[PDB]
């Protein structure tokens, strides 16, 4: 037959395709009203605030306001250390630190070792 | 290069296009004919017919704006308003 | 921009240049080697007994 | 350095004695011709350093970032001269003040010939740029941000004190020349373990190195534009100097102690450039940039070798000089639009073509444009580490690509794009400003003619 | 001008053109109009120039430094003499630089003046650069960022004891 | 789904939107155009032999199954008209669009040189500031309790009175400026 | 001596000098293009004529003329290095300039900004002629970094656009990685060698050179648009056609496959680079022209074309070949500058309608664009006598009797037959066939400037092949006795692929439907490559740098370990400290506490 | 700005939830907040995870180039999905196809040209035969040292 779309994190689902959109039940018309009506309040409100003649300046957007300090500021007072913090501050805070310096302190012994018996390849090396 | 357009031409060549469907009639044909009203079509032929305006002035207008092109001079005022006539 | 274009052969780094100029000249002709291998006169050198 | 210490001690009085509303042009008039009268400190040598008395002397080290210093506070006083129109003659009077003392005071500390000097000059720089913080910031928890850089340069300092003082009872001076000519090596035990962490992690903290650094996002946003170009331009480079002076008396343990400090930098600026990637506040990005700069400072200076240091002197005062120029791009768009949020100005091309030619410009010296200096720097630092081990090409090629990866964006959002709608107040590009940015960008593009006096010591 | 030892070059070989066909070749022709119309303007220009530096000459001099005891012949932390001595090791340092820099030169422009044949024509260049970047790396290798005469000298005693032990090993 | 007025899409718009979707992009499979017309006219009678429904169930699921069909059969690379957002030319001298109120930071002699033009500007800025008053004062008592419903604002009702918020559309910037 | 230098010191000078003219300048420019155009052409010729000296001699040399930097003991300085790579492809990139200035004045004269235009554009090329005549590899960095900058700004020339901007932010990204692999090879040959110049670098001649080489390598996949990072040529398709033309065809792209020819004498002692080369440009060539079958958009299709030349051109140097991928270069650039030249002109006749499945009739309404089409299409496949059959029908005859890949050569054949496939395709739908542009018809092509120009580079594509294939000195031994059947391939393969693809497109003018395979999806959405990456790559990224870099660490754990750890202790054990009652009689049995302890649990009187 | 306008914790209640959509202007059940695994989300509300892209372009937005409403509470990672940026449109294909189809056609050549470097093609004809001891002296040999000669006869 054909070949049904499995949705993914980085591929959605298509809008025409949902079930719920095609749902004709009362609950839903008076949701898609409600969000309607608070659309069309918040509309009349920025062009209410827009077309004013006498206003020369920024016209205040309370939501971009909200936005920058939950992402900045709220972080902190909102923050409970339990196990699943503490597993990911330990897996990514200092688990490629130790990695990298393993691996480097590896190499580097391996090239003062390969130095100090003298075969390295060090002829034309006089910038460091 | 990019010659401008006329209303008056605009609405001549909506009536060319409109005047060479074969669905319709070269002699009631107006300029304030209702498509279903005063002619008598479909709404399949009403969205076929707005496909072939936007197949004509090689642009796409939009289904919401599309349902209430519904007059020959509602499809001129809509092209008025999207080209910038009278300048 | 006149000031930093002119500053008067700065930190000898041309002279030492012209030095050069003279000093393999010098190497050139008395057949010595173009340079030591150590910095310092090797006579005047007592390293620790072993 | 009494021909430089006693003009700026009369300058102290000459914006003390003029009127309202000469203040400026006086102080602006007599500011450059003390520059002007900066550059005679560029009789250096190959060799040796140029002294002058007891107390202070200059090399090849030191004199850019004197010269940077005293250029950058005239460009301060524009900076700084229209959001304090409203305030106070008095207060007005106090804050051109406090700049002055600060660069009477740095002027003071970047020539000082003993250590401890040094030092208690280092700590003395802290008063009036926390005053300038907690006074004239504009943001409502600045008392958070100058309480916090105070501390850390405090909890910092004071063990690099002891230290010092250790050292100088230890062996018997604290001169540089002496220190030059007295140095001895320091065995591997753990006193000079933890002489090593007493002698480095004031510079560390005021670098900033990756973990301390919290205290840089914070007081380069509340701040004013002339607090966040002295704690962006010069005092990172102040204990980037600091440690290039005492890095001298930790040999050779240092060559297995700054192990994991290094890499504590060769990880982390990867993921806070990460955070310039998802940062929604522009004075933040710039100083997410910042530590970018200086962790690679870091690394450079650390690994002691030769073109490291000239790539960390270079890269020092590029990156000073693009890092003050985007501050006051960054208060120039603030001022216009009286929000810090990147998201809400956009399409500023279409109204602004002269500040959107200067915010290319400060972007693409951001990024490392050739043959500018911070090309000639980071390039340096790159061969000097790849000297050092293979694999950390890496560790700053990647980085390559998320520099960019920001500072383009940067140039996007803020310029390209749909102007917003709402946003009516966009005034033509002011005569100051656009002397200023010129003030900011012509001497490095000067510079990047002649970079051999900025190249560090050993040149 | 320049020194001919100190930069050398081998003489010129330049072979006559002979014309093989019967059209003109045009390189000629832009040459004589090049010396026609350019040559001589500059000539006289410089000839002029020339003039005006002949009737008002200076002149100037090379600096010179005689020699101090070196830091081997210095008393330990003590600084008058041995300040002196890092002082004359440092402007060694940096006409040994500017040495190495007249070698690389030579290579260079033996390369490019021989072209093709730079395997078989510079193999003296070539040797003489490996000579002296031994030399160098013996010298001023490993030294550090905050390198000084002490530590060039404790190079030196480890470079010669590690002589004495491989002449010892192998006897 | 997300309209500006209507606050759902009812059957027959979303039949319409379907039927205009598959004509774009069966055209874009048959780009020569007797092959198209004769695949337009067969999709026509397709649509044409379940035209007349009388059960709503019926027709939801046989929509449903027609939808999959055609993102069974969609071009993958759909026909975009120029000046429609994916095409090509979209949205390009929307970089040129400069707002007019720019106009009101000139300087004085650049000016002078326009004379009427800003003559005929300062009577439509007056004009504008003369009619926000009765404009809002119109849109204060229409608006019933709650705030509007839809997103449609009223026209404009008295005579000399002009439409309630109609700065920012009728001064818009040209197309082509 | 004295005439070349000068003249080519002029040569640059003249270019230079409109910049410095326009960044001076006070009033409105009468006809500025037409200036910066008579400039074009006048250094076209100046630096022609010690082109023409050098075929005549045979003289190259090195002008190191400003003393720079003299860092340690490194020197850097302001070095020219003439010899036949630039000698050869300087002019012919000035002619295709000086065609792209006409095309440019034509084309963007409803542009008010286009002084800025064509200061971005010359300005570019001298970052390119920088890039070509680079002695040291910092002068190389210079161009490089420069034509990746300039080729972003020229790519958001339309900056409201957001497409433009994110193709641009792409480009930079994979100009970026590029330049990893480029600070990479320059970091080992400073450290191993040092030097950062040609001649010491080609005179030392390192035996472990593998390291360099993949360096290189990585360059080169970065800037010439290879496979891993091809997507953004084919993406910057958005910017104006003058510059798809001159910059993302022609002179650009190419920059990596000119430093690998630069660096012939390090790669002809080491198979294991020759064999990576030859792999990444079989492989680039066949999945570009696999995109290039089944598209649309007729720019995207001539930018899957050059992608897929570039690819052909990296498997010819694989093959120790460097001199026949230069006249591949020098061969290549005149006829995909006139097959873009003549797209664009086409374009703007038909109000900007860019899908070819708009098109057609286009045979007779367009008569010289026809022609230039068809010429170029033919010069693109190997027609003999023309441009190309002097360079890529020979990079065939060294494809085939050599010690070379199988695999390789078999899909550099079929890519040959995808390329006579794409091009006779875009000759079926857009010259040929039936009209289907909307009924308004504008076509004219009747302006001087246009007509002029691609008669210009109609005569180049014509003669300019025959000139540089018999006017090059013989630079290495071309192969002679080679069996008939190898002789033939190139004109089979070609043959071949004209006769099967008039024969789908035959099969596509029938009146039938079909459902699309699996491998017209694979072939229409680029291999699936932008599709899938584009949309994991970043989207991996930045979740990395928002719930394990921003939020997780530097403002939650790190604020949590030092100084919150501490306030919070202080704070507590201060509130114990200062919660007294105020009671003395507490304070005195405290005290007598304290003296006990003190007397004996410590013993503080001995 | 006023401090009860302003994101604040995590609500547990019906009647925090609901005061959170007052000030958030959403419904009460759309208002559905991250879970409280302490990771500072606060009260921010979860929108669907969907680029700008996917709203429909032909509604006229106060903002055109984001594709958002004036005070149209944003998602929690709106720099993540803007146009220029990370998008979630849906594909002609599905995306597990896309990527096995992807590896499986990048493996099969890469094995392709591993056989094919282990099989090579050539001429058959033998090796280039080179004067003067396969050119000892031009290689950069030592002209006091004679190695082996080499000497190439006729056939």
């Not at chain 7, 002008?63 to 860092?71: A, G, K, P, V």
């Not at chain 7, 995109?291 to 498997?315: E, H, P, R, W, Y």
Request: include cysteine; hydrophobic fraction near 45%; glycine fraction near 4%.
């Amino acid at each position: 037959s054909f070949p049904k779309y499995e949705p993914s994190r980085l591929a959605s689902l298509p809008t025409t395709l949902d079930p719920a959109e095609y749902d004709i039940s009362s609950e839903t018309r008076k949701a898609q009203a409600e969000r309607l009506a608070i659309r069309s309040r918040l509309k009349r409100e920025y062009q209410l605030q827009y077309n004013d003649p006498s206003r020369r300046g920024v016209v205040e957007d309370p939501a971009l306001i909200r936005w920058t300090c939950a992402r900045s500021a709220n972080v902190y007072p909102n923050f409970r250390p339990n196990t699943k913090t503490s597993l990911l501050g330990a897996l990514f805070g200092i688990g490629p630190l130790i990695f990298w310096y393993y691996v480097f302190k590896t190499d580097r012994d391996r090239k003062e070792k390969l130095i100090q018996e003298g075969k390295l390849d060090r002829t034309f090396n006089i910038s460091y | 290069d990019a010659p401008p357009l006329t209303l008056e031409g605009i609405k001549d060549r909506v009536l060319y296009v409109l005047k060479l469907y074969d669905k319709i009639d070269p002699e009631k044909l107006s300029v304030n004919s209702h498509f279903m009203k005063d002619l008598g079509l479909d709404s399949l032929d009403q969205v076929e017919i707005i496909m072939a305006m936007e197949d004509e002035f090689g642009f796409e207008i939009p289904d919401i704006d599309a349902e209430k092109l519904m007059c020959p001079q509602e499809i001129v005022d809509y092209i008025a308003d999207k080209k910038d006539v009278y300048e | 921009s006149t000031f930093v274009a002119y500053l008067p052969d700065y930190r000898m780094q041309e002279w030492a240049r012209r030095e050069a100029e003279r000093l393999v000249k010098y190497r050139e002709a008395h057949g010595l080697p173009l340079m030591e291998s150590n910095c310092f006169d090797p006579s005047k050198i007592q390293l620790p007994e072993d | 350095m009494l021909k430089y210490i006693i003009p700026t001690m009369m300058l102290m009085p000459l914006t003390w004695l003029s009127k309202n509303s000469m203040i400026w042009i006086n102080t602006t008039l007599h500011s450059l011709l003390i520059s002007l009268t900066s550059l005679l400190l560029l009789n250096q040598f190959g060799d040796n350093s140029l002294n002058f008395s007891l107390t202070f002397f200059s090399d090849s080290l030191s004199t850019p970032l004197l010269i940077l210093t005293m250029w950058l506070l005239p460009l301060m006083l524009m900076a700084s001269q229209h959001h304090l129109s409203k305030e106070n003659l008095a207060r007005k009077k106090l804050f051109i003040s406090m700049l002055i003392l600060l660069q009477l005071f740095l002027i003071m500390t970047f020539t000082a010939t003993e250590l401890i000097f040094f030092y208690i000059m280092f700590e003395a720089t802290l008063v009036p740029t926390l005053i300038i913080i907690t006074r004239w910031g504009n943001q409502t928890e600045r008392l958070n941000a100058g309480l916090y850089f105070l501390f850390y340069t405090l909890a910092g300092s004071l063990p690099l004190l002891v230290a010092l003082i250790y050292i100088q009872n230890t062996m018997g001076s604290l001169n540089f020349l002496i220190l030059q000519y007295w140095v001895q090596p320091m065995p591997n035990s753990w006193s000079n373990t933890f002489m090593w962490l007493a002698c480095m992690m004031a510079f560390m903290v005021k670098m900033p190195l990756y973990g301390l650094h919290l205290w840089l996002p914070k007081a380069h946003v509340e701040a004013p534009i002339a607090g966040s170009m002295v704690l962006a331009a010069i005092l990172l480079k102040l204990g980037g100097y600091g440690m290039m002076r005492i890095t001298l008396l930790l040999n050779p343990i240092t060559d297995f102690m700054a192990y994991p400090f290094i890499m504590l930098s060769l990880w982390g600026m990867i993921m806070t450039s990460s955070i310039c990637l998802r940062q929604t506040d522009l004075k933040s990005l710039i100083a997410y940039s910042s530590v970018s700069h200086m962790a690679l400072v870091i690394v450079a200076i650390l690994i002691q070798t030769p073109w490291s240091y000239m790539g960390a002197t270079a890269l020092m005062i590029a990156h000073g000089l693009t890092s003050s120029m985007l501050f006051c791009l960054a208060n120039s768009n603030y001022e216009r639009v009286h929000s810090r949020t990147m998201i809400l100005a956009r399409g500023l091309q279409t109204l602004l073509p002269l500040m959107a030619a200067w915010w290319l410009l400060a972007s693409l010296t951001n990024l490392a444009l050739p043959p500018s200096i911070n090309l000639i720097g980071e390039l340096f630092v790159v061969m000097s580490t790849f000297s050092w081990s293979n694999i950390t090409i890496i560790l700053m090629g990647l980085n390559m690509v998320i520099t960019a990866l920001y500072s383009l964006y940067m140039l996007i959002t803020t310029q390209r794009g749909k102007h917003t709608h709402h946003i009516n107040n966009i005034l033509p590009s002011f005569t100051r400003e656009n002397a200023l940015m010129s003030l900011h960008m012509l001497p490095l593009l000067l510079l990047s003619l002649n970079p051999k006096i900025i190249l560090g010591p050993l040149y | 001008s320049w020194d001919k030892d100190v930069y050398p070059e081998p003489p010129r070989r330049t072979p006559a053109p002979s014309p093989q066909t019967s059209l003109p070749n045009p390189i000629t022709y832009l040459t004589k109009a090049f010396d026609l119309l350019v040559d001589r303007p500059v000539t006289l220009v410089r000839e002029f120039i020339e003039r005006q530096h002949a009737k008002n000459k200076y002149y100037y001099y090379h600096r010179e430094f005689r020699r101090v005891p070196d830091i081997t012949e210095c008393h330990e932390k003590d600084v008058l003499c041995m300040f002196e001595a890092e002082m004359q090791w440092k402007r060694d340092y940096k006409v040994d630089q500017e040495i190495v820099n007249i070698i690389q030169e030579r290579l260079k422009a033996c390369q490019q003046r021989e072209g093709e044949s730079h395997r078989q024509n510079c193999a003296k260049e070539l040797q003489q650069f490996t000579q002296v970047v031994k030399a160098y790396q013996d010298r001023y290798h490993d030294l550090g960022a905050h390198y000084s005469a002490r530590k060039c000298l404790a190079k030196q005693k480890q470079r010669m004891l590690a002589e004495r032990k491989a002449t010892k090993e192998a006897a | 789904a997300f309209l500006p007025s209507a606050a759902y899409l009812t059957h027959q718009q979303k039949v319409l939107q379907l039927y205009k979707r598959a004509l774009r992009h069966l055209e874009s499979r048959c780009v020569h155009r007797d092959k198209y017309r004769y695949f337009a006219c067969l999709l026509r009678a397709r649509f044409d032999e379940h035209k007349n429904e009388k059960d709503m169930v019926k027709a939801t699921q046989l929509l449903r199954e027609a939808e999959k069909e055609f993102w069974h059969g969609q071009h993958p690379q759909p026909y975009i008209f120029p000046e429609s957002p994916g095409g090509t030319s979209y949205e390009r001298y929307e970089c040129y669009k400069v707002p007019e109120w720019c106009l009101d930071d000139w300087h004085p002699s650049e000016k002078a040189m326009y004379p009427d033009y800003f003559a005929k500007r300062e009577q439509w800025k007056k004009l504008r500031r003369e009619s926000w008053e009765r404009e809002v004062k119109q849109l204060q008592e229409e608006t019933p309790v709650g705030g509007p419903r839809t997103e449609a604002l009223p026209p404009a009702r008295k005579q000399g009175d002009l439409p309630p918020l109609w700065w920012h559309i009728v001064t818009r910037p040209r197309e082509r400026p | 001596m004295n005439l070349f230098s000068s003249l080519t010191l002029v040569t640059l000078i003249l270019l230079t000098m409109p910049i410095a003219a326009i960044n001076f300048n006070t009033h409105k420019f009468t006809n500025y293009p037409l200036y910066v155009k008579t400039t074009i052409s006048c250094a076209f010729i100046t630096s022609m004529i010690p082109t023409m000296m050098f075929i005549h001699t045979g003289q190259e040399m090195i002008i190191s003329n400003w003393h720079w930097l003299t860092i340690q003991t490194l020197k850097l300085s302001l070095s020219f290095k003439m010899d036949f790579f630039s000698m050869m492809f300087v002019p012919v990139a000035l002619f295709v300039t000086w065609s792209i200035m006409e095309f440019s004045m034509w084309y963007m004269h409803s542009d008010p900004n286009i002084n800025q235009f064509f200061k971005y554009l010359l300005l570019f090329l001298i970052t390119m002629l920088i890039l070509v005549t680079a002695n040291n590899l910092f002068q190389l960095f210079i161009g490089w970094e420069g034509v990746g900058i300039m080729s972003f700004l020229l790519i958001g020339w339309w900056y409201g656009r957001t497409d433009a901007n994110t193709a641009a932010l792409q480009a930079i990204l994979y100009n970026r990685i590029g330049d990893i692999g480029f600070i990479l090879a320059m970091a080992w040959f400073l450290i191993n060698l040092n030097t950062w110049d040609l001649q010491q670098i080609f005179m030392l001649n390192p035996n472990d050179s593998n390291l360099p080489l993949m360096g290189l390598i990585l360059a080169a996949t970065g800037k010439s648009a290879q496979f891993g990072l091809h997507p953004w040529l084919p993406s910057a398709m958005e910017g104006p056609t003058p510059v798809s033309a001159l910059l993302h065809s022609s002179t650009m792209v190419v920059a990596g496959i000119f430093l690998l020819i630069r660096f012939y004498p390090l790669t002809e002692n080491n198979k294991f680079g020759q064999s990576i080369m030859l792999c990444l440009g079989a492989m680039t060539t066949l999945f570009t022209a696999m995109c290039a079958l089944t598209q649309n958009d007729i720019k995207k299709i001539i930018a899957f074309s050059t992608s897929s030349q570039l690819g052909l051109m990296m498997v010819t140097i694989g093959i120790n070949q460097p001199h026949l991928a230069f006249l591949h270069i020098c061969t290549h650039a005149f006829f995909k500058a006139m097959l873009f030249m003549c797209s664009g002109s086409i374009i703007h006749s038909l109000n900007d309608e860019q899908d070819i499945r708009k098109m057609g009739g286009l045979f007779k309404a367009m008569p010289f664009t026809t022609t230039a089409l068809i010429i170029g299409s033919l010069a693109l496949t190997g027609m003999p006598f023309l441009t190309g059959f002097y360079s890529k029908d020979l990079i065939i005859e060294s494809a085939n009797t050599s010690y070379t890949n199988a695999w390789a050569l078999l899909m550099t054949l079929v890519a040959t037959s995808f390329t006579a496939i794409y091009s006779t395709r875009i000759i079926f739908f857009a010259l040929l066939g039936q009209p289907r542009f909307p009924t308004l018809i504008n076509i004219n092509e009747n302006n001087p400037f246009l007509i002029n120009s691609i008669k210009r580079l109609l005569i180049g594509s014509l003669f300019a092949g025959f000139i540089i294939s018999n006017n090059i000195p013989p630079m290495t031994i071309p192969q002679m006795t080679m069996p008939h059947y190898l002789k033939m391939t190139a004109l089979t393969v070609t043959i071949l692929g004209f006769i099967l693809a008039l024969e789908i497109s035959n099969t596509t003018h029938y009146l039938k439907f079909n459902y699309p395979s699996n491998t017209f999806k694979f072939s229409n959405l680029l291999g699936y490559y932008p599709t899938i990456m584009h949309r994991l790559t970043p989207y991996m990224n930045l979740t990395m740098s928002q719930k394990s870099a921003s939020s997780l660490l530097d403002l939650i754990w790190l604020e949590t370990i030092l100084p919150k750890t501490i306030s919070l202790a202080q704070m507590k054990m201060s509130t114990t400290i200062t919660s007294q009652k105020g009671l003395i009689k507490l304070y005195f049995l405290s005290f007598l506490i304290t003296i006990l302890i003190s007397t004996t649990l410590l013993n503080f009187h001995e | 700005i006023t401090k009860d306008m302003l994101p604040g914790p995590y609500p547990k209640t019906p009647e925090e939830r609901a005061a959170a959509a007052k000030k958030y202007n959403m419904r009460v059940e759309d208002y559905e907040p991250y879970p409280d695994d302490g990771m500072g989300y606060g009260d921010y509300p979860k929108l669907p995870d969907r680029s700008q892209q996917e709203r429909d372009p032909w509604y006229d937005w106060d903002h055109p180039d984001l594709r958002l409403n004036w005070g149209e509470p944003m998602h929690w990672d709106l720099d993540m999905y803007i146009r220029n940026r990370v998008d979630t449109s849906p594909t002609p294909v599905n995306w597990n196809l896309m990527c096995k189809h992807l590896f499986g056609f990048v493996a099969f050549m890469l094995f392709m040209f591993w056989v094919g470097e282990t099989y090579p093609t050539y001429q058959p004809v033998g090796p280039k035969q080179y004067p003067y001891n396969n050119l000892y002296l031009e290689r950069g040999g030592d002209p006091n040292k004679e190695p082996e000669p080499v000497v190439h006869y006729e056939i």
